[PDB]
Structures are given as C-alpha cells and as structure tokens.
PDB file of C-alpha atoms and ligand atoms in Angstrom:
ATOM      1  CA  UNK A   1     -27.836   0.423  -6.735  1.00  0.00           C
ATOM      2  CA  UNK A   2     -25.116   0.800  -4.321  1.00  0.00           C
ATOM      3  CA  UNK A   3     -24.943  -1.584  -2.065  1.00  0.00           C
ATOM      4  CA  UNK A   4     -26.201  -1.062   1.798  1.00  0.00           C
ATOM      5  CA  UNK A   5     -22.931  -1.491   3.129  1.00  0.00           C
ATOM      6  CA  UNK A   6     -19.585  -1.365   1.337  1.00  0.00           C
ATOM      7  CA  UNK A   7     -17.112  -4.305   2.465  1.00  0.00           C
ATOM      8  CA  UNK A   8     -13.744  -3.055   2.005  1.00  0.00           C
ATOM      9  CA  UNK A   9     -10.617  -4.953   2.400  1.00  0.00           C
ATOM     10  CA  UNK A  10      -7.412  -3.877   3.902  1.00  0.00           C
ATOM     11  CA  UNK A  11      -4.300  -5.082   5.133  1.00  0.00           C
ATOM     12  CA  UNK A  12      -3.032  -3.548   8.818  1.00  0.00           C
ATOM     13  CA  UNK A  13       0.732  -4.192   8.804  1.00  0.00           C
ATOM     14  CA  UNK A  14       1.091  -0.384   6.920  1.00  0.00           C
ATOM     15  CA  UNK A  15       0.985   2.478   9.450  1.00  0.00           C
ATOM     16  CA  UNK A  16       0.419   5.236   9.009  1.00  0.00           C
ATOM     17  CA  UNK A  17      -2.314   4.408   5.877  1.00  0.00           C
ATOM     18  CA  UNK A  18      -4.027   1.022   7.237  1.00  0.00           C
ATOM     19  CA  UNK A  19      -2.868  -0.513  10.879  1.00  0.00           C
ATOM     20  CA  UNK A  20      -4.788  -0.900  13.974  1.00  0.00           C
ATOM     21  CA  UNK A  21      -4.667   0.357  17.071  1.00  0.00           C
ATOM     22  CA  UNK A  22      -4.561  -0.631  20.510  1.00  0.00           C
ATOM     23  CA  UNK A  23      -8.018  -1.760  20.269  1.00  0.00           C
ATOM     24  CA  UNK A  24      -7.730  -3.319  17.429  1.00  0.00           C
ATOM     25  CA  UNK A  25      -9.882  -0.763  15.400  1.00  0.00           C
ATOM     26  CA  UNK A  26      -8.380   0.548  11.967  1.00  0.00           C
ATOM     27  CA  UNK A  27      -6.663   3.517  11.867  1.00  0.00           C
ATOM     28  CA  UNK A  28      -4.581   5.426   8.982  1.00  0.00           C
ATOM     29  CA  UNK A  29      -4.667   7.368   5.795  1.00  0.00           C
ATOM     30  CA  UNK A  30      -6.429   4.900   3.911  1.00  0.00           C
ATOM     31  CA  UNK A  31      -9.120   4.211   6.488  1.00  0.00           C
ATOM     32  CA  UNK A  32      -9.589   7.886   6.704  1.00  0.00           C
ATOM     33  CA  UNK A  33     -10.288   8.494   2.607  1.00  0.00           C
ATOM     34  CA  UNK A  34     -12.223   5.274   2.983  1.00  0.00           C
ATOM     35  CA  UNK A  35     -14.597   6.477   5.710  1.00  0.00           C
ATOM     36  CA  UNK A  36     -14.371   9.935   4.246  1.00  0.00           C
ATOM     37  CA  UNK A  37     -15.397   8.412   0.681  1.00  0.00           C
ATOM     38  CA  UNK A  38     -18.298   6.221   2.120  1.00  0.00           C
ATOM     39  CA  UNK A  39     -20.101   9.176   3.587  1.00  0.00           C
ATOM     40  CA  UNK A  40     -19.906  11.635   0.651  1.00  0.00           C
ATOM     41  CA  UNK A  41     -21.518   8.059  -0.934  1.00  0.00           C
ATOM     42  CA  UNK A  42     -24.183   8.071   1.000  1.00  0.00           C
ATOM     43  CA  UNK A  43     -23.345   4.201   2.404  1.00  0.00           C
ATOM     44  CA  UNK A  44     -22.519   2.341   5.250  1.00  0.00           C
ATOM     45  CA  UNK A  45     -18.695   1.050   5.216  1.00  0.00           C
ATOM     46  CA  UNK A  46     -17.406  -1.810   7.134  1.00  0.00           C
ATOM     47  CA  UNK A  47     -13.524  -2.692   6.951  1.00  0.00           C
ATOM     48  CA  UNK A  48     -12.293  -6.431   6.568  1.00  0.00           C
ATOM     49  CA  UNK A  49      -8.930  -6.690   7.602  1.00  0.00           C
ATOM     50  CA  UNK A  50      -6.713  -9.794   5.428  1.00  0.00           C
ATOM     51  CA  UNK A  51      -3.163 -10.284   4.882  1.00  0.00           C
ATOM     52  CA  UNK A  52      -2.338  -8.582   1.258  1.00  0.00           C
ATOM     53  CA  UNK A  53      -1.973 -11.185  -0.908  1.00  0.00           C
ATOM     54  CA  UNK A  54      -5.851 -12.279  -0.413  1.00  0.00           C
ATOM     55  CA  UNK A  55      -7.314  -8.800  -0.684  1.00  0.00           C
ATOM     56  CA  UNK A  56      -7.785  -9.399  -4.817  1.00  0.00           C
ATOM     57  CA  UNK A  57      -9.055 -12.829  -4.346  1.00  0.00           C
ATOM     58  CA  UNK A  58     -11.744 -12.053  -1.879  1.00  0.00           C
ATOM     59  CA  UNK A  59     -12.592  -8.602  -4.331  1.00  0.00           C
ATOM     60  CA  UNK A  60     -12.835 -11.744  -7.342  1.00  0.00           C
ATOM     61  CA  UNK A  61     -14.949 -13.583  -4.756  1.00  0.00           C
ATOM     62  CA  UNK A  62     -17.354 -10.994  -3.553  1.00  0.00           C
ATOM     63  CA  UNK A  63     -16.034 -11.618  -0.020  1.00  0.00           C
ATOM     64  CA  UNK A  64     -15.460  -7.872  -0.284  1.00  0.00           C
ATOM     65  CA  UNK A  65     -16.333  -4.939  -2.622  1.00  0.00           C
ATOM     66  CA  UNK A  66     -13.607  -2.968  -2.606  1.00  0.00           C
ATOM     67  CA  UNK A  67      -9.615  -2.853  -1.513  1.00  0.00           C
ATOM     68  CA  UNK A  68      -8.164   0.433  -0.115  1.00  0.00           C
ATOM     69  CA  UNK A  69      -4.807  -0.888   1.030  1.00  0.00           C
ATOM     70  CA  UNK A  70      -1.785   1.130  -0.319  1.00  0.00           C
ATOM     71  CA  UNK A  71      -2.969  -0.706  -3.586  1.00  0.00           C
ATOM     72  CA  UNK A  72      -0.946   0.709  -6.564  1.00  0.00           C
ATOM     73  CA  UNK A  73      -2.728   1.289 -10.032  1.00  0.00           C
ATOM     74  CA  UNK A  74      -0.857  -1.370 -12.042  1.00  0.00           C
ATOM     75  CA  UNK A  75      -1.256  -2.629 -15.712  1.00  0.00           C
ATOM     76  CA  UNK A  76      -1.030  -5.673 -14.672  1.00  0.00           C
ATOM     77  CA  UNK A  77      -3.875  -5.979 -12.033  1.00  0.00           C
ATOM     78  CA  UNK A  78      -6.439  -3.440 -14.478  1.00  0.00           C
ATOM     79  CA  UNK A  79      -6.109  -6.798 -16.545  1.00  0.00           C
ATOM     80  CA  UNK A  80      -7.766  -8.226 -13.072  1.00  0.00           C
ATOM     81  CA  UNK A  81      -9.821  -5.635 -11.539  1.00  0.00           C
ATOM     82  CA  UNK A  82     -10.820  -1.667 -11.903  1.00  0.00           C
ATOM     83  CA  UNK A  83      -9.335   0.719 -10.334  1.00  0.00           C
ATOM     84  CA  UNK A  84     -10.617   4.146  -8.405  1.00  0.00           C
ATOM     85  CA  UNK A  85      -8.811   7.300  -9.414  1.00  0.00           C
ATOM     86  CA  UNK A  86      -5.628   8.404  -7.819  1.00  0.00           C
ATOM     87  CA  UNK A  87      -6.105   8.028  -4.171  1.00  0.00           C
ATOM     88  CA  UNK A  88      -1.841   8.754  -3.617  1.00  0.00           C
ATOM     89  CA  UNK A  89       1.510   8.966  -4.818  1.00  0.00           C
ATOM     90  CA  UNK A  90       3.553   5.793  -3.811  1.00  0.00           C
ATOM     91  CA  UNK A  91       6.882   4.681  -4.943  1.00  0.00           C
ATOM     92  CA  UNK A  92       9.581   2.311  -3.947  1.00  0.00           C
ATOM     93  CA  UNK A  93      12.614   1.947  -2.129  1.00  0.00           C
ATOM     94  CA  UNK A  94      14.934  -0.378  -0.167  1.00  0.00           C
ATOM     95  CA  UNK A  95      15.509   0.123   3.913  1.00  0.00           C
ATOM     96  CA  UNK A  96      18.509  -1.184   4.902  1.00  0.00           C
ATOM     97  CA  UNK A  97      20.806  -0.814   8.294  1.00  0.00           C
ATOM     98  CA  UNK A  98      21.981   2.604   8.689  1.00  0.00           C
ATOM     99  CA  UNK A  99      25.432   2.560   6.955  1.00  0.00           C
ATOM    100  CA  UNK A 100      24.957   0.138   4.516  1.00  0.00           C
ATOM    101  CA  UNK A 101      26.217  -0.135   1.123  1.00  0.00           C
ATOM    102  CA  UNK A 102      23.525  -1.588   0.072  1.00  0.00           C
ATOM    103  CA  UNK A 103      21.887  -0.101  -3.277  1.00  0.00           C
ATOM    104  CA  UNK A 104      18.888  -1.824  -5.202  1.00  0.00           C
ATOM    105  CA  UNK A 105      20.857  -3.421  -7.783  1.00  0.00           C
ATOM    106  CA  UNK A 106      21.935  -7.073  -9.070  1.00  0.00           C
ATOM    107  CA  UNK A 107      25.299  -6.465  -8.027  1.00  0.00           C
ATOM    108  CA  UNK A 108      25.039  -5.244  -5.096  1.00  0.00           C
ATOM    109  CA  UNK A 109      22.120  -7.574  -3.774  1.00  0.00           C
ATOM    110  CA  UNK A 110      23.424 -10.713  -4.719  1.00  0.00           C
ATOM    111  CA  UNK A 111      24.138 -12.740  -1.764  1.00  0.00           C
ATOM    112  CA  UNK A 112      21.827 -11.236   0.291  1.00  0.00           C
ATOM    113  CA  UNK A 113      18.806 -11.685   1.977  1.00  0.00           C
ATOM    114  CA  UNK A 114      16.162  -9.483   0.870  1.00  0.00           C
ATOM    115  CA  UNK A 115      12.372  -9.459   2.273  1.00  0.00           C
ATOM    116  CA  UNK A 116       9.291  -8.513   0.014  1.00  0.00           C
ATOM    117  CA  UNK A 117       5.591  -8.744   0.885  1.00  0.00           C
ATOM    118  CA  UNK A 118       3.509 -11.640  -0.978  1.00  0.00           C
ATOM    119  CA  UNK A 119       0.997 -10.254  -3.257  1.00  0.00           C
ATOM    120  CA  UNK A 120       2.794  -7.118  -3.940  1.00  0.00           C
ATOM    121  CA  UNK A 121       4.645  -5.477  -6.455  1.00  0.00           C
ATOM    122  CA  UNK A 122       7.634  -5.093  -4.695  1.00  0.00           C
ATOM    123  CA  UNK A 123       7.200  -9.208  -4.825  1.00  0.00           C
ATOM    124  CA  UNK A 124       6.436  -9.077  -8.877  1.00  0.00           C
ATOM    125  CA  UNK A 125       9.746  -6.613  -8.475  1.00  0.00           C
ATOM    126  CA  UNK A 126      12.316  -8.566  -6.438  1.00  0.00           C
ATOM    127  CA  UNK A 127      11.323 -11.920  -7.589  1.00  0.00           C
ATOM    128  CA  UNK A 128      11.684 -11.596 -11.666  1.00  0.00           C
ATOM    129  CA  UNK A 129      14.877  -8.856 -11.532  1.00  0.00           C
ATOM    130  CA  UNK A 130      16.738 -10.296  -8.168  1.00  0.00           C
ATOM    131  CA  UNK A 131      15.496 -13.860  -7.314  1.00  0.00           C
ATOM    132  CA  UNK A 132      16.036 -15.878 -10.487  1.00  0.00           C
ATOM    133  CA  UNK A 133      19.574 -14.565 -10.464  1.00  0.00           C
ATOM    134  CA  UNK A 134      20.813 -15.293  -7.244  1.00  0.00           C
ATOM    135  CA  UNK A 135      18.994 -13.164  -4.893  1.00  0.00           C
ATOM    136  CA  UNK A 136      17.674 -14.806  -1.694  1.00  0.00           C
ATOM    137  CA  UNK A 137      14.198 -13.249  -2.113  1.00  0.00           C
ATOM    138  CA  UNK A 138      12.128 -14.076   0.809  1.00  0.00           C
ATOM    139  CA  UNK A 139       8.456 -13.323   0.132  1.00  0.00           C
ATOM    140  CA  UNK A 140       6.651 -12.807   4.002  1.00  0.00           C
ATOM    141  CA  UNK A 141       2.639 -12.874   4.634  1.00  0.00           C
ATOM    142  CA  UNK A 142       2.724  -9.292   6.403  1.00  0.00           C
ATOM    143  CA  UNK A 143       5.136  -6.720   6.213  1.00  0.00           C
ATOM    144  CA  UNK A 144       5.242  -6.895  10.571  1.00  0.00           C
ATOM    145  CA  UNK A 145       7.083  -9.948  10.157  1.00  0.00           C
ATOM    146  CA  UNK A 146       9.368  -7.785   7.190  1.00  0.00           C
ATOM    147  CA  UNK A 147      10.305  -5.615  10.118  1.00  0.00           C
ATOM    148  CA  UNK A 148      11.015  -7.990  12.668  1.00  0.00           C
ATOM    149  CA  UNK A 149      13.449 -10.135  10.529  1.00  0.00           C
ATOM    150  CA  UNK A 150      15.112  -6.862   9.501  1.00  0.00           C
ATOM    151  CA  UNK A 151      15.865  -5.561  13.064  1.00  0.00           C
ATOM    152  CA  UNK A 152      16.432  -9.137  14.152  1.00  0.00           C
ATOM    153  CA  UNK A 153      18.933  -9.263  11.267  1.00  0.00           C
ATOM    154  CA  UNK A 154      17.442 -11.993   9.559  1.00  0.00           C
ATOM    155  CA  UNK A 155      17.278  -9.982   6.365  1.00  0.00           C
ATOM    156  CA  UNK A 156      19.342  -7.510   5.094  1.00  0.00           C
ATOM    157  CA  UNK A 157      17.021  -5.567   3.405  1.00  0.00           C
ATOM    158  CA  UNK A 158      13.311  -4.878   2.532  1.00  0.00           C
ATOM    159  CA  UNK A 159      11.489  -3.325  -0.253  1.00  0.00           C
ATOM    160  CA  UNK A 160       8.597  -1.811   0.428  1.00  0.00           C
ATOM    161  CA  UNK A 161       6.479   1.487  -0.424  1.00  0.00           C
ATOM    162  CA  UNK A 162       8.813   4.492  -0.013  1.00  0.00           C
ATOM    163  CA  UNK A 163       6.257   6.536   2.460  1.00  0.00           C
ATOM    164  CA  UNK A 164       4.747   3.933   4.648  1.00  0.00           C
ATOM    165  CA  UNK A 165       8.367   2.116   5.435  1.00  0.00           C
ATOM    166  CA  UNK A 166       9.062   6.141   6.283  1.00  0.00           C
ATOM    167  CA  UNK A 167       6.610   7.275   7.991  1.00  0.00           C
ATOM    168  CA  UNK A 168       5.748   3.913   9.932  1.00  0.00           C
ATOM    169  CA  UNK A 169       9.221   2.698  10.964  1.00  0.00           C
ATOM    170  CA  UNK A 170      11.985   4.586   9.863  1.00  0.00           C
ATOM    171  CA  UNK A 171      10.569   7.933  11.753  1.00  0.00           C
ATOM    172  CA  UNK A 172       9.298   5.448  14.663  1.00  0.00           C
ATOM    173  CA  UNK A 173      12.034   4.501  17.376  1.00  0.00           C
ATOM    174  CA  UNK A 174      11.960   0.577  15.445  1.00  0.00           C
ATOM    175  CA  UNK A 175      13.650   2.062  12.575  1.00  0.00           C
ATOM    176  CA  UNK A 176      15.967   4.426  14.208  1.00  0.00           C
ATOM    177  CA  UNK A 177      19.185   2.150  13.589  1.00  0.00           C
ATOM    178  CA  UNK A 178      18.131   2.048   9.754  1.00  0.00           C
ATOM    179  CA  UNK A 179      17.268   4.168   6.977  1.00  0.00           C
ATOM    180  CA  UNK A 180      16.793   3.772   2.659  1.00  0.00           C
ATOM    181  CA  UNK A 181      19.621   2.065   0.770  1.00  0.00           C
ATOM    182  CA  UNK A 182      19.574   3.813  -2.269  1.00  0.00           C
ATOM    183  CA  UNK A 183      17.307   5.995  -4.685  1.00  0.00           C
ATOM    184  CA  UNK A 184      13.792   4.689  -4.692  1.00  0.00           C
ATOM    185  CA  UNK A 185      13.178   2.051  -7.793  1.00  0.00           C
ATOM    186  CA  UNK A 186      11.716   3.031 -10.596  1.00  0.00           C
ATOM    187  CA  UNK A 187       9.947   1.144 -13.014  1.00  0.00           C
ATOM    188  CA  UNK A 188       6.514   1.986 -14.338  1.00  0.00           C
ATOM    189  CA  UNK A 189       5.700  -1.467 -15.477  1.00  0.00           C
ATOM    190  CA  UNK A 190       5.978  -3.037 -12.032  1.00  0.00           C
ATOM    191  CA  UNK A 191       5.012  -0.261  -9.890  1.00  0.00           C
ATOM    192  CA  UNK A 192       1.968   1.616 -11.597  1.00  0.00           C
ATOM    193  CA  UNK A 193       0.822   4.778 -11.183  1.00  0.00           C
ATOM    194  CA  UNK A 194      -0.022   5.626  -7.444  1.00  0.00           C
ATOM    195  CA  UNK A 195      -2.927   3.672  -5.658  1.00  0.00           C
ATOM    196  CA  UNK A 196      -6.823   3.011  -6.015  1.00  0.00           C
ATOM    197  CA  UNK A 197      -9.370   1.729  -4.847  1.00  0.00           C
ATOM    198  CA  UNK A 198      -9.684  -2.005  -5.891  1.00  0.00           C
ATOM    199  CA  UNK A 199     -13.471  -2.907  -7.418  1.00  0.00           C
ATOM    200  CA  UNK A 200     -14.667  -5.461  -9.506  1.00  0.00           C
ATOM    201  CA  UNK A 201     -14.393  -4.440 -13.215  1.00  0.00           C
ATOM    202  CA  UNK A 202     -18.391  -4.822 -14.099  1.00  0.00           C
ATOM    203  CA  UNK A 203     -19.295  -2.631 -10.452  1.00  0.00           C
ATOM    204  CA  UNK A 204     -19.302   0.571 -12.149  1.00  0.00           C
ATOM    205  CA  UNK A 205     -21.954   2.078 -10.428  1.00  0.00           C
ATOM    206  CA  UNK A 206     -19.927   1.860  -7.453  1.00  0.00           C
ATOM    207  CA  UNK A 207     -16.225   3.117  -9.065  1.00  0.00           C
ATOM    208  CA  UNK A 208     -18.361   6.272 -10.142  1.00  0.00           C
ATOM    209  CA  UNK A 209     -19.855   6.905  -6.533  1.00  0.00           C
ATOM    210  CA  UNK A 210     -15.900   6.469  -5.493  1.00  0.00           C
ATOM    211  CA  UNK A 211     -14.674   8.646  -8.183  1.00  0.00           C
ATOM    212  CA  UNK A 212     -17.162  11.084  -7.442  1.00  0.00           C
ATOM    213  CA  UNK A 213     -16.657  11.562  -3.780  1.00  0.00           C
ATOM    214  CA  UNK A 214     -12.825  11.255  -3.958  1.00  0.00           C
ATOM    215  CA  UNK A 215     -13.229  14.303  -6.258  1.00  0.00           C
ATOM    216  CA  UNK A 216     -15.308  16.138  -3.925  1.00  0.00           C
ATOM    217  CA  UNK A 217     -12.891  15.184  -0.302  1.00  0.00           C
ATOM    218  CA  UNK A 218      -9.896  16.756  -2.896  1.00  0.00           C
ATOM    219  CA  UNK A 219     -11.978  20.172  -3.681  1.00  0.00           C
ATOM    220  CA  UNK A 220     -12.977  21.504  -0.837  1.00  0.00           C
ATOM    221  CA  UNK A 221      -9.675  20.358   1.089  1.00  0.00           C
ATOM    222  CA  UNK A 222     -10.812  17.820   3.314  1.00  0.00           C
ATOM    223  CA  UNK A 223      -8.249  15.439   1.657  1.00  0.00           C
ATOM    224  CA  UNK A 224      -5.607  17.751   2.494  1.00  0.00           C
ATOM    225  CA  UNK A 225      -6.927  18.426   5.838  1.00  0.00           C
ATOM    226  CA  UNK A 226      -6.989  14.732   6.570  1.00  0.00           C
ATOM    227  CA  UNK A 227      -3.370  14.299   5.199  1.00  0.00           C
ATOM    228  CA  UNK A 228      -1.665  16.380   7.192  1.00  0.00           C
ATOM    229  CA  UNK A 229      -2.235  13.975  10.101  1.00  0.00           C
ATOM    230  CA  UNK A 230       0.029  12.150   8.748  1.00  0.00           C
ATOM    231  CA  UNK A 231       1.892  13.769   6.575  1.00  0.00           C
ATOM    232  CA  UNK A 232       4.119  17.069   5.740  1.00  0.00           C
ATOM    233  CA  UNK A 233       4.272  17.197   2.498  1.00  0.00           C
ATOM    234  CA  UNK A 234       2.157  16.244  -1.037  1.00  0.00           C
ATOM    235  CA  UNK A 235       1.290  12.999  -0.616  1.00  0.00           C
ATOM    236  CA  UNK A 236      -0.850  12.890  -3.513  1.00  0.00           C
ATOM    237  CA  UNK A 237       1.730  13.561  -5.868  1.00  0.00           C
ATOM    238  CA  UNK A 238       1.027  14.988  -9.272  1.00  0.00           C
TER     239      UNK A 238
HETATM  240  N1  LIG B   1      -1.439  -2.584   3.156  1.00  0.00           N
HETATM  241  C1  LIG B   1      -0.313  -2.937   2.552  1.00  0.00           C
HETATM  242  N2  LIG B   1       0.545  -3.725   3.184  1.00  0.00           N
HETATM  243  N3  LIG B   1      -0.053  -2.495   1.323  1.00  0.00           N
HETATM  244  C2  LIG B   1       1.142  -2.823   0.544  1.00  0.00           C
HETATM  245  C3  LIG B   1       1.088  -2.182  -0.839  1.00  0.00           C
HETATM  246  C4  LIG B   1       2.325  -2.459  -1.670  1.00  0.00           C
HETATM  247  C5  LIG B   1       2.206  -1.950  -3.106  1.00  0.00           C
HETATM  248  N4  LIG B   1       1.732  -0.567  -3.133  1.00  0.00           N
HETATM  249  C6  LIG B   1       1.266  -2.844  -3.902  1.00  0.00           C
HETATM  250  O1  LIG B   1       0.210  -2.377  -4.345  1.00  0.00           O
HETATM  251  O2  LIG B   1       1.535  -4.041  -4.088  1.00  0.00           O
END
C-alpha cells in the first residue's frame, strides 16, 4: 500500500547531508539514507528540492510524502507530523569570525546581527530567547544566503546545525577565516532529539517500511559504510 514512488522533500543549502552538485543532482548524507531506505522498501524515490520552511507544508499538502532534510525530531512538530526513527545526531551551535568573543548568550548577542534559517529550530531558538530582547534576528530563506552575509560581514553570527555548518563550510576554504563561538546550545525543548524522516501522521504503512529499512542499512553496516563518506566520527550519536 506503499505508494509507487515516494516524493521526498529536501532542502539543498546543507552539504554535506542534502546539496547539489554541479549538475544540479542531489548529493549528501541524507540523499544517501534516503536512496538507501527506498530500495530496502522496495519503491521508487524521487527527491523534490524546496527551501526549508515549505518542506512541512507541502508533507500537510501531499505535494510530498516524506522530508529527509536534517529535520530534527521535535515535540513541537510530532504535534504536526510523524516522525521516522533516529536517522542522526544533530545539535547546535553558533559560527562566528575566527577570534570572536562571541558566545550564544543574551549578553553577549545583544547588539548584534545574528542569521537563522526560516522554518527551523534554530529560528523557534533565536527568535523567542534573543529577538524579543534586543537581538537583531534575521531569519533568511536558505542557509547559502546565511553564509554569504556572514563572510560578507553582514551578520555577525549564524546558528545553525553543529555538523553541517562543520563539515560544509567551516572545513571548506569559505569558512576558513571562521570557526564556532561558543559551546553548542542546548535545549531539548527547541532542538529535539536528532532527525527523522518527516511523514504524515495517519501514513503508517509507510513510517513502518522506513523504520524497517533504516533498521536493516544500521545492521549490517551499510549506514556506517555510507557515513564515513562524510564523516569521521559517530554521526548517529547514541
Ligand atoms: N536542509 C536543511 N537546511 N536543514 C536544516 C535543519 C535545521 C534543524 N535541524 C531543523 O530541523 O530545523
């Protein structure tokens, strides 16, 4: 009762899970559980690239069945839409020029300009704890444009997941001149638990096929096999 083809949503401003490459196909972590996933399922699986903040609406639409898009497991959106297991770890943290003082704080933030990506919950973050008290919070449709008003030195800072601002800028010759500002943020509420695969609430047939073959990629080591890719350490996290 699955369907023929799988549409799943993703946003491509997040090397190295979800970005695309010169020819504009998708390429990343995500696109490789996704395709991996979509196999073991038995079903065809064709990506829809959006900016973030319309990947939920167009899962609430049926413009798409599913979201893989660095999209953490939140209380807040499981009030909204189900969730796969555990795809990854992700957590939170501020970039910042190299040498800044910067830390993610109230004190330390007010008066400056801070860049967050609309939809997320470094948005929900940055907009109820720094924005309403004096924060210039400056929410951006993709997290390229983040980047660019970062190095241009339009912002001061962005927050953004921990791994992806790592892995995709801070390691790549864009980020060179700037690194975290501080611990990464915590705050279960905000951030959830890892990320999932976004799916309608009543499409349980389809969470179980997900659940089921995300189990399988993780026990016989292809997900581990397909991480290191990317990454050098435990990206999945506990
Ligand atoms: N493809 C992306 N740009 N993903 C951003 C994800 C940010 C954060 N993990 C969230 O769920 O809101």
């Amino acid at each position: 009762a699955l369907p023929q083809t799988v549409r799943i949503g993703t946003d491509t401003t997040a090397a190295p899970f979800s970005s695309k490459d010169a020819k504009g196909e998708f390429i990343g972590f995500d696109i490789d559980l996704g395709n991996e996933m979509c196999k073991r399922m038995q079903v065809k699986c064709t990506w829809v690239a959006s900016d973030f903040d319309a990947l939920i609406p167009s899962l609430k639409a049926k413009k798409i069945d599913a979201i893989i898009s660095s999209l953490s497991i939140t209380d807040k959106r499981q009030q909204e839409i189900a969730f796969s297991d555990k795809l990854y770890a992700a957590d939170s943290r501020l970039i910042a020029a190299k040498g800044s003082p910067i830390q993610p704080t109230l004190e330390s933030l007010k008066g400056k300009h801070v860049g967050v990506l609309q939809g997320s919950t470094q948005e929900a973050y940055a907009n109820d704890n720094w924005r309403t008290k004096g924060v210039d919070v400056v929410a951006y449709a993709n997290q390229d444009l983040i980047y660019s008003d970062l190095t241009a030195g339009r912002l001061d800072a962005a927050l953004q997941d921990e791994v992806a601002a790592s892995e995709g800028f801070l390691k790549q010759p864009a980020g060179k001149e700037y690194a975290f500002a501080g611990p990464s943020v915590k705050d279960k509420k905000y951030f959830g638990d890892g990320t999932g695969v976004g799916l309608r609430k009543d499409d349980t047939e389809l969470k179980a096929a997900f659940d089921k073959a995300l189990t399988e990629l993780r026990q016989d080591g292809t997900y581990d096999k397909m991480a290191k890719k990317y990454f050098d350490f435990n990206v999945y996290g506990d």
